[PDB]
Amino acid sequence: KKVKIAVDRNPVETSFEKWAKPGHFSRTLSKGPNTTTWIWNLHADAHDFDSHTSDLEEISRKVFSAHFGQLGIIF
Amino acid sequence: LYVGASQSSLAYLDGSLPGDFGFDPLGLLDPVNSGGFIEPKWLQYSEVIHARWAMLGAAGCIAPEVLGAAGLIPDATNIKWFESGVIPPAGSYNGYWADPYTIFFVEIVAMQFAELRRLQDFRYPGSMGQQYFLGLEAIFKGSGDAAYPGGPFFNLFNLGKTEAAMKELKLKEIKNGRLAMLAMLGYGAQAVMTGKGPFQNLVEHLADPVNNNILTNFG
Amino acid sequence: DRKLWAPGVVAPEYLKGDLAGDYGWDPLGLGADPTALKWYRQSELQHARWAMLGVAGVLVQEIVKPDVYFYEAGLPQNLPEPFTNINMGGLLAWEFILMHWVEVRRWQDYKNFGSVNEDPIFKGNKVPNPEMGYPGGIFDPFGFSKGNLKELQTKEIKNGRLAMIAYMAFILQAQATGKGPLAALSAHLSNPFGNNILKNIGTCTVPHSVDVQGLTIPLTCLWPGSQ
Amino acid sequence: MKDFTTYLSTAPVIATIWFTFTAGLLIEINRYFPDPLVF
Amino acid sequence: VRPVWFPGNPPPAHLDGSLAGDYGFDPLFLGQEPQTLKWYVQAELVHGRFAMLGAAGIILTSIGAKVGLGFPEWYDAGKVVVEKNNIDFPTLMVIQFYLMGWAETKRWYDFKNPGSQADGSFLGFTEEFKGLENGYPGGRFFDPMGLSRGDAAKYQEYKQKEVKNGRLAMIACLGFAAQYAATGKGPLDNLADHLADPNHVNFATNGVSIPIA
Amino acid sequence: YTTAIGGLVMAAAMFFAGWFHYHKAAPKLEWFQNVESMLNHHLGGLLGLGSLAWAGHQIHVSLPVNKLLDAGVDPKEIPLPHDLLLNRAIMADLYPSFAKGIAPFFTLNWSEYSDFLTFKGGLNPVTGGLWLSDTAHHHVAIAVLFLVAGHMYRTNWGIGHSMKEILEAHRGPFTGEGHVGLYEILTTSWHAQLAINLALFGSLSIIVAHHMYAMPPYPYLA
Amino acid sequence: FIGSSTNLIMVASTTATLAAARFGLAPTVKKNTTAGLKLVDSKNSAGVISNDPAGFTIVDVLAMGAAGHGLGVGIVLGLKGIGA
Ligand code: CLA
Ligand code: CLA
Ligand code: CLA
Ligand code: CLA
Ligand SMILES: CC1=C[C@H](O)CC(C)(C)[C@H]1/C=C/C(C)=C/C=C/C(C)=C/C=C/C=C(C)/C=C/C=C(C)/C=C/C1=C(C)C[C@H](O)CC1(C)C
Ligand SMILES: CC1=C(/C=C/C(C)=C/C=C/C(C)=C/C=C/C=C(C)/C=C/C=C(C)/C=C/C2=C(C)CCCC2(C)C)C(C)(C)CCC1
Ligand SMILES: CCCCCCCCCCCCC/C=C\[C@H](O)[C@H](N)CO
Ligand SMILES: CCCCCCCCCCCCCCCC(=O)O
Ligand SMILES: CCCCCCCCCCCC(=O)O
């Protein structure tokens, strides 16, 4: 009922550990490649945020950051 | 206490902070789900920093005109606060010992040392007292509050021996700082509207208030 | 307890009153390191003695020689006979050699206490040297140290501090007005409302440079006034 | 740095760097040797 | 404990103060790996030594140029030497590349296999190429005075002095390049211009460094 | 060139904002579901303040510079924008209403500003595009309309509306319950909001194409 | 400007809008309206603490000031638009 600024501090840590692990966002692609189809899947489910997890808060936060990156590209 | 108080802002404003009048209709000090820069410690620290900077600014913006009108300083000086080289389009003073960019580089180095050490003490309380700084680290320890560091230099005369006296002085500082901030905003607005100095506006308004105000200065 | 410099302030823990003239004044905390404190005490003693000598020299020079400016007294054309128009290079060589020798001896005394008291040429000629910066012996032939040395050292350091302030006042007075302290005092007494720091400031009587014989020495005032 | 090097060792980054190097070499070759049609 | 490049900031794990001139300055973590840090240590030492030689030569030549000796500036010495003396520029480049190639190749393969150059395959010399530490090649040829084989504390102090002087010389060479590209004269000419008028002759008045001035 | 440097700075700021909001201060789900406050801000602040700021730039820079360009003045001899923004003499010469300051605005004498806020219509016979005075007046009206619309929904005070209340109040005999549950659908599904936004956005883009060939707003565009 | 029709109309408009909300005749921060335009209690998140006998807070003053300004500006421009 109150409109305020709700926030969480340091939810995700800034690191390059996940950059070396392709397909970490999805549970199906986290295993690794076995066939070439997987590679295509890696690009088809990249922005599919409601498929990585069922938490609406995580999806909204990812959407917000995606919007900022898009505006940076436009600038 | 003041106008605009609310039951929601009173949940986190219990008079602990200095100058707490319960004026927070925008809810910026709510500790529930707080982060980044919108949090009580940083906000109070920023307010006291703006308070002190605005106090020096208001005094420095109204001092040369008052001293010039009193005949204490010569005619070469006594210029408007926005005509002293601050904004070259509004006017610049060439009587300095060097161009404003050289003095700006000096200010860059000086302000970087002061502000960066201040920030490092805020991020880590007491970390400015261990590393060697020509023996000056003995007075850069501060305290638990980054807004009120103290020590042999920042508290030269050791004022506020009693907790009540320190609280009274803190409230006086925050109130004078808020008044100075409003005065600085008024200085900028009057400079943009009237195009003259603040003391000149005060004199013109004191001569004939009915014909000298914001309503008559529109056109 | 001793009287502090400010009413209500608390003196530092490293300033208990052992040294002379200890008012518990150290806003920068430069005395936290004991080695640095001893070095600064020697530096303050040197500054105090040199300032007292300079202040007394300026005053006596203005009294005995009222027509010679103490600021421009360093020029070779203002030196008295038989040192007029003398080569400043040899003069600098003399001062450098003698001052270098005595200052190296004093520095060695600071680094290693009681290690250079003996005369290196004539054995047996030593100085007592009770504390650092207080050699005595040949330096104090009248023997005034065989008594209350605490109050005497306190008077020495206080007079030296006052002389330091006085000599800097002399320098700024000569830089803003262009005359000696006695002449400036007489000028101020002639008209206090006309000759003060309110009007004399902003003017730097010191020129941009001086040509001492062949080379040019750059000169400046302590503040960016009008040259 | 190990993770950063592993990321730079992935197929798209390696492909980008390799094709940039090959394209640059071919472009510089045609620049210093304009219009080569025969040997 | 030890001083750092940014007071209050904890030093990184890959910088524990064992190396000379260690101030914990690595915001990009370029030397987090041990082998990479070893390679970067040798690179920094070589850079500082070359920068020291360059700064000393440039300062001495500019000193001779300011006085009436006819010394050319550092940005024209190559042309003056090649045109004054009948010296072929590509021949000199090839000779320099041959000597530097031999020296740097021996140093590189010594970095890959420490102590390998001491096998005696190069004219029978063994202890002259055994090497002391990484980037510190002790021996009778590189250190004939034997300062690296005596008084360990003095050796560590000299190591700290060497790394600090090398970093200062690198900054000095960068300043030489910027000063020549912005003012057009030599470093001592800029120093004389600044000493003649420090309030009006600086980087804030050259008209190139600050474009909005 | 300065605008390019500013754009690069803004790009770095946008990237830093994304990193900060994902790894340093990530808002909760309740912050994203404040559609009333979000709409109030996007209507008043974003659209209204953007239109007002552009109106100010058009009145103080586009109007005098373009008027001088259409008057035959060489581009090098035209005064700089800050020169026009610093003194009232040049602006008063190009537009006499500027000699009165902001006084006619507060005295409800807006008719005095009839030299740079008109309804000329048609196109400029010299450049071929729309009159910039009309576009400036347009942006002023648009800013006032959006700023007024930005105070419609309730946020933290009693005044304002609740979109759920308005949706539930709209129900007729031929539709059953009506818009019940639509508020919960749009406040919890990003795909539904994306569908609505993409449809209206694409429609507005096509409308932009038609309005731009029909009414050319830029000089020498037609 | 003081005493002119523009000033009188604007002052009367602002005073009329301020008098209606305080005397329970216009929507306030404490009393909302239904679809049949009937006053009823609200659920304000702020809950501004006011000393007024009817609970007239500063938010009501700002809202009524804006409403009166809009009505006054429209009335003045409308009369100036019809030549009256
Ligand atoms: C999609 C845009 C957007 C949105 C919705 C938000 C929203 C939020 N930000 Mg954020 N931010 C953004 C973009 C955005 N930001 C960008 C682009 C940057 C990089 C500059 C930042 C950097 C940033 C930081 C560092 C922080 C936030 C914080 C916050 C939170 C509360 C503070 C606040 O913004 O309240 C109100 C805003 C203010 C009180 C300050 C605004 C003053 C600006 C500088 C005025 C100038 C900008 C203006 C639009 C230009 C007008 C022109 C002018 C010259 C006339 C809030 C949820 C804080 C947080 O994490 O809280 C939890 C926080 O610390 N933001
Ligand atoms: C250098 C700073 C930095 C670092 C170390 C990280 C690190 C991390 N981020 Mg993060 N982030 C950053 C900045 C950073 N981020 C910024 C600036 C933004 C705003 C855009 C975000 C927004 C963000 C989100 C929303 C998420 C992460 C996630 C993650 C984690 C894994 C994803 C990943 O990195 O794969 C590497 C990914 C890439 C290399 C793709 C980058 C593409 C960029 C953004 C746009 C490229 C545009 C391109 C040029 C245009 C295409 C045209 C084409 C022809 C070239 C990881 C630990 C994810 C996570 O935590 O998992 C749950 C998560 O969902 N980040
Ligand atoms: C007057 C306040 C205000 C303003 C101006 C904006 C502006 C914007 N919002 Mg935001 N928002 C606001 C309030 C505001 N919001 C509030 C109160 C909430 C919480 C209910 C949100 C929640 C929200 C979400 C969830 C999202 C936005 C998004 C956006 C951007 C849409 C991109 C676009 O097409 O526009 C035009 C683009 C530009 C004009 C680019 C220039 C950007 C400048 C700097 C304006 C930024 C102003 C903003 C208030 C940040 C300043 C705060 C300070 C801390 C930096 C846009 C810049 C989207 C986004 O995240 O984009 C990144 C988005 O997903 N907003
Ligand atoms: C958002 C849009 C916008 C903006 C930014 C401006 C801005 C400006 N307009 Mg303008 N205008 C606009 C829209 C806008 N206008 C529209 C839509 C119209 C049509 C109705 C007009 C019609 C108009 C006219 C007729 C005139 C102006 C004028 C002006 C200038 C002076 C304003 C004034 O009269 O004093 C107002 C006083 C203020 C705005 C106060 C300023 C507050 C300052 C910034 C505070 C700074 C304080 C700070 C803390 C200081 C500390 C700094 C520290 C370093 C010491 C000014 C730069 C005048 C002009 O340019 O003369 C030629 C003029 O006569 N405008
Ligand atoms: C309370 C509240 C609560 C809720 O809830 C929320 C809200 C609403 C947000 C709120 C409010 C707030 C506010 C009011 C704010 C404001 C502020 C200001 C004004 C500041 C200023 C501020 C100001 C400032 C800093 C200023 C400063 C200044 C200065 C330095 C100056 C300087 C100078 C001088 C000396 C003189 C010369 O000639 C010039 C110069 C050189 C330049
Ligand atoms: C008797 C009494 C009293 C008094 C009270 C008062 C007097 C109040 C008031 C108040 C007021 C007197 C207020 C005012 C206000 C205002 C406002 C709030 C405004 C505004 C604005 C706006 C928003 C506008 C807008 C616009 C524009 C800008 C343009 C276009 C058009 C329009 C309109 C849209 C007391 C309590 C003391 C005591 C008891 C009783
Ligand atoms: C008149 C010819 C004099 C020699 C001219 C140069 C020849 C160069 C040969 C240098 C000999 C290098 C190796 C010397 C000694 C080796 O360490 C031992 N033979 C290995 O047992
Ligand atoms: C103008 C350029 C002349 C260069 C003269 C080449 C002299 C030979 C130097 C080649 C060194 C190659 C080192 C081996 C490669 C490696 O260590 O990985
Ligand atoms: C654009 C808004 C149009 C509003 C139409 C209102 C019609 C009144 C219907 C009231 C029905 C009721 O409250 O019983």
PDB file of N, CA and C in Angstrom, chain E residues 172-212:
ATOM      1  N   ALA E 172      58.938   9.446 -16.832  1.00  0.00           N
ATOM      2  CA  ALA E 172      59.737  10.517 -17.416  1.00  0.00           C
ATOM      3  C   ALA E 172      59.767  10.428 -18.935  1.00  0.00           C
ATOM      4  N   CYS E 173      59.894   9.215 -19.477  1.00  0.00           N
ATOM      5  CA  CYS E 173      59.907   9.051 -20.928  1.00  0.00           C
ATOM      6  C   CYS E 173      58.543   9.386 -21.521  1.00  0.00           C
ATOM      7  N   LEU E 174      57.469   9.014 -20.815  1.00  0.00           N
ATOM      8  CA  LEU E 174      56.135   9.364 -21.292  1.00  0.00           C
ATOM      9  C   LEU E 174      55.963  10.878 -21.277  1.00  0.00           C
ATOM     10  N   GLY E 175      56.521  11.528 -20.253  1.00  0.00           N
ATOM     11  CA  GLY E 175      56.463  12.974 -20.176  1.00  0.00           C
ATOM     12  C   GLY E 175      57.274  13.630 -21.275  1.00  0.00           C
ATOM     13  N   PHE E 176      58.401  13.015 -21.652  1.00  0.00           N
ATOM     14  CA  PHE E 176      59.218  13.557 -22.734  1.00  0.00           C
ATOM     15  C   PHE E 176      58.436  13.532 -24.038  1.00  0.00           C
ATOM     16  N   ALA E 177      57.766  12.406 -24.304  1.00  0.00           N
ATOM     17  CA  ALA E 177      56.984  12.274 -25.531  1.00  0.00           C
ATOM     18  C   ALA E 177      55.822  13.262 -25.557  1.00  0.00           C
ATOM     19  N   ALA E 178      55.105  13.395 -24.435  1.00  0.00           N
ATOM     20  CA  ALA E 178      53.986  14.337 -24.392  1.00  0.00           C
ATOM     21  C   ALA E 178      54.465  15.780 -24.509  1.00  0.00           C
ATOM     22  N   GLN E 179      55.585  16.110 -23.866  1.00  0.00           N
ATOM     23  CA  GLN E 179      56.116  17.465 -23.931  1.00  0.00           C
ATOM     24  C   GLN E 179      56.562  17.814 -25.341  1.00  0.00           C
ATOM     25  N   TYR E 180      57.169  16.859 -26.047  1.00  0.00           N
ATOM     26  CA  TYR E 180      57.594  17.135 -27.411  1.00  0.00           C
ATOM     27  C   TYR E 180      56.396  17.247 -28.346  1.00  0.00           C
ATOM     28  N   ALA E 181      55.356  16.444 -28.118  1.00  0.00           N
ATOM     29  CA  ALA E 181      54.196  16.518 -28.999  1.00  0.00           C
ATOM     30  C   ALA E 181      53.307  17.720 -28.697  1.00  0.00           C
ATOM     31  N   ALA E 182      53.398  18.291 -27.495  1.00  0.00           N
ATOM     32  CA  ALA E 182      52.546  19.426 -27.146  1.00  0.00           C
ATOM     33  C   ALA E 182      53.243  20.781 -27.276  1.00  0.00           C
ATOM     34  N   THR E 183      54.521  20.862 -26.902  1.00  0.00           N
ATOM     35  CA  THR E 183      55.227  22.136 -26.987  1.00  0.00           C
ATOM     36  C   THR E 183      56.156  22.212 -28.193  1.00  0.00           C
ATOM     37  N   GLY E 184      56.703  21.085 -28.639  1.00  0.00           N
ATOM     38  CA  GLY E 184      57.585  21.088 -29.790  1.00  0.00           C
ATOM     39  C   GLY E 184      59.062  21.252 -29.510  1.00  0.00           C
ATOM     40  N   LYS E 185      59.458  21.500 -28.268  1.00  0.00           N
ATOM     41  CA  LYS E 185      60.861  21.672 -27.910  1.00  0.00           C
ATOM     42  C   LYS E 185      61.315  20.531 -27.002  1.00  0.00           C
ATOM     43  N   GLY E 186      62.583  20.585 -26.608  1.00  0.00           N
ATOM     44  CA  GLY E 186      63.158  19.582 -25.747  1.00  0.00           C
ATOM     45  C   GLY E 186      62.706  19.724 -24.308  1.00  0.00           C
ATOM     46  N   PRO E 187      62.981  18.703 -23.489  1.00  0.00           N
ATOM     47  CA  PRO E 187      62.573  18.770 -22.074  1.00  0.00           C
ATOM     48  C   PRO E 187      63.257  19.876 -21.284  1.00  0.00           C
ATOM     49  N   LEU E 188      64.540  20.147 -21.542  1.00  0.00           N
ATOM     50  CA  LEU E 188      65.190  21.217 -20.797  1.00  0.00           C
ATOM     51  C   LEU E 188      64.732  22.583 -21.277  1.00  0.00           C
ATOM     52  N   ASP E 189      64.325  22.691 -22.543  1.00  0.00           N
ATOM     53  CA  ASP E 189      63.804  23.962 -23.027  1.00  0.00           C
ATOM     54  C   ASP E 189      62.486  24.260 -22.329  1.00  0.00           C
ATOM     55  N   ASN E 190      61.679  23.215 -22.113  1.00  0.00           N
ATOM     56  CA  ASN E 190      60.421  23.362 -21.395  1.00  0.00           C
ATOM     57  C   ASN E 190      60.680  23.701 -19.937  1.00  0.00           C
ATOM     58  N   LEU E 191      61.725  23.104 -19.353  1.00  0.00           N
ATOM     59  CA  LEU E 191      62.059  23.396 -17.963  1.00  0.00           C
ATOM     60  C   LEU E 191      62.509  24.844 -17.807  1.00  0.00           C
ATOM     61  N   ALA E 192      63.297  25.348 -18.761  1.00  0.00           N
ATOM     62  CA  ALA E 192      63.742  26.738 -18.693  1.00  0.00           C
ATOM     63  C   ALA E 192      62.570  27.691 -18.890  1.00  0.00           C
ATOM     64  N   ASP E 193      61.643  27.344 -19.792  1.00  0.00           N
ATOM     65  CA  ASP E 193      60.470  28.185 -20.004  1.00  0.00           C
ATOM     66  C   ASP E 193      59.593  28.210 -18.760  1.00  0.00           C
ATOM     67  N   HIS E 194      59.480  27.070 -18.075  1.00  0.00           N
ATOM     68  CA  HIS E 194      58.673  27.015 -16.865  1.00  0.00           C
ATOM     69  C   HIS E 194      59.347  27.744 -15.714  1.00  0.00           C
ATOM     70  N   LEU E 195      60.667  27.610 -15.580  1.00  0.00           N
ATOM     71  CA  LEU E 195      61.362  28.293 -14.496  1.00  0.00           C
ATOM     72  C   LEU E 195      61.372  29.797 -14.721  1.00  0.00           C
ATOM     73  N   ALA E 196      61.320  30.231 -15.984  1.00  0.00           N
ATOM     74  CA  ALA E 196      61.291  31.660 -16.264  1.00  0.00           C
ATOM     75  C   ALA E 196      59.960  32.272 -15.841  1.00  0.00           C
ATOM     76  N   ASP E 197      58.872  31.516 -15.968  1.00  0.00           N
ATOM     77  CA  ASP E 197      57.540  31.994 -15.596  1.00  0.00           C
ATOM     78  C   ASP E 197      56.664  30.799 -15.267  1.00  0.00           C
ATOM     79  N   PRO E 198      56.667  30.356 -14.009  1.00  0.00           N
ATOM     80  CA  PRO E 198      55.847  29.187 -13.651  1.00  0.00           C
ATOM     81  C   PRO E 198      54.359  29.465 -13.577  1.00  0.00           C
ATOM     82  N   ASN E 199      53.955  30.715 -13.363  1.00  0.00           N
ATOM     83  CA  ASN E 199      52.531  30.998 -13.253  1.00  0.00           C
ATOM     84  C   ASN E 199      51.843  31.059 -14.606  1.00  0.00           C
ATOM     85  N   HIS E 200      52.582  31.324 -15.683  1.00  0.00           N
ATOM     86  CA  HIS E 200      51.960  31.431 -16.994  1.00  0.00           C
ATOM     87  C   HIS E 200      52.499  30.455 -18.034  1.00  0.00           C
ATOM     88  N   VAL E 201      53.548  29.695 -17.737  1.00  0.00           N
ATOM     89  CA  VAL E 201      54.100  28.739 -18.697  1.00  0.00           C
ATOM     90  C   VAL E 201      53.991  27.357 -18.068  1.00  0.00           C
ATOM     91  N   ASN E 202      52.909  26.645 -18.367  1.00  0.00           N
ATOM     92  CA  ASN E 202      52.680  25.305 -17.838  1.00  0.00           C
ATOM     93  C   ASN E 202      51.779  24.555 -18.813  1.00  0.00           C
ATOM     94  N   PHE E 203      51.245  23.412 -18.373  1.00  0.00           N
ATOM     95  CA  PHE E 203      50.373  22.632 -19.248  1.00  0.00           C
ATOM     96  C   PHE E 203      49.004  23.278 -19.403  1.00  0.00           C
ATOM     97  N   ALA E 204      48.610  24.141 -18.470  1.00  0.00           N
ATOM     98  CA  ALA E 204      47.307  24.780 -18.573  1.00  0.00           C
ATOM     99  C   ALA E 204      47.314  25.979 -19.508  1.00  0.00           C
ATOM    100  N   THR E 205      48.473  26.354 -20.046  1.00  0.00           N
ATOM    101  CA  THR E 205      48.584  27.489 -20.946  1.00  0.00           C
ATOM    102  C   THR E 205      49.261  27.147 -22.265  1.00  0.00           C
ATOM    103  N   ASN E 206      49.582  25.877 -22.516  1.00  0.00           N
ATOM    104  CA  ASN E 206      50.237  25.552 -23.778  1.00  0.00           C
ATOM    105  C   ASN E 206      49.275  25.567 -24.961  1.00  0.00           C
ATOM    106  N   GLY E 207      47.967  25.575 -24.711  1.00  0.00           N
ATOM    107  CA  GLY E 207      46.978  25.603 -25.768  1.00  0.00           C
ATOM    108  C   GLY E 207      46.711  24.280 -26.446  1.00  0.00           C
ATOM    109  N   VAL E 208      47.340  23.195 -25.994  1.00  0.00           N
ATOM    110  CA  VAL E 208      47.160  21.877 -26.578  1.00  0.00           C
ATOM    111  C   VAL E 208      46.597  20.884 -25.571  1.00  0.00           C
ATOM    112  N   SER E 209      47.127  20.891 -24.344  1.00  0.00           N
ATOM    113  CA  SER E 209      46.685  19.957 -23.312  1.00  0.00           C
ATOM    114  C   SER E 209      45.224  20.170 -22.943  1.00  0.00           C
ATOM    115  N   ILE E 210      44.850  21.394 -22.596  1.00  0.00           N
ATOM    116  CA  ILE E 210      43.460  21.670 -22.241  1.00  0.00           C
ATOM    117  C   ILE E 210      42.825  22.363 -23.440  1.00  0.00           C
ATOM    118  N   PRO E 211      41.952  21.677 -24.181  1.00  0.00           N
ATOM    119  CA  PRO E 211      41.345  22.308 -25.359  1.00  0.00           C
ATOM    120  C   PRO E 211      40.320  23.367 -25.022  1.00  0.00           C
ATOM    121  N   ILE E 212      39.660  23.270 -23.862  1.00  0.00           N
ATOM    122  CA  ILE E 212      38.657  24.269 -23.499  1.00  0.00           C
ATOM    123  C   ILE E 212      39.267  25.520 -22.892  1.00  0.00           C
TER     124      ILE E 212
END
